[PDB]
Amino acid sequence: GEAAAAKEAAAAKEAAAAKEAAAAKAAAWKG
Ligand code: NA
Ligand code: NA
16 A cells, blocks of 8 residues: 555665765765
8 A cells, every 4th residue: 555655765765865975976086
C-alpha cells in the first residue's frame, strides 16, 4: 500500500542526493 510506495520515494531521493555530492566534489578537488 502506501508502505511500499514510501520506500520507493526514500530510495530514489537518497540516491539522487548522493550523486550531487560526488559531482560537486570532483569539480572542487581538481581546482
Ligand atoms: Na519512476
Ligand atoms: Na553537485
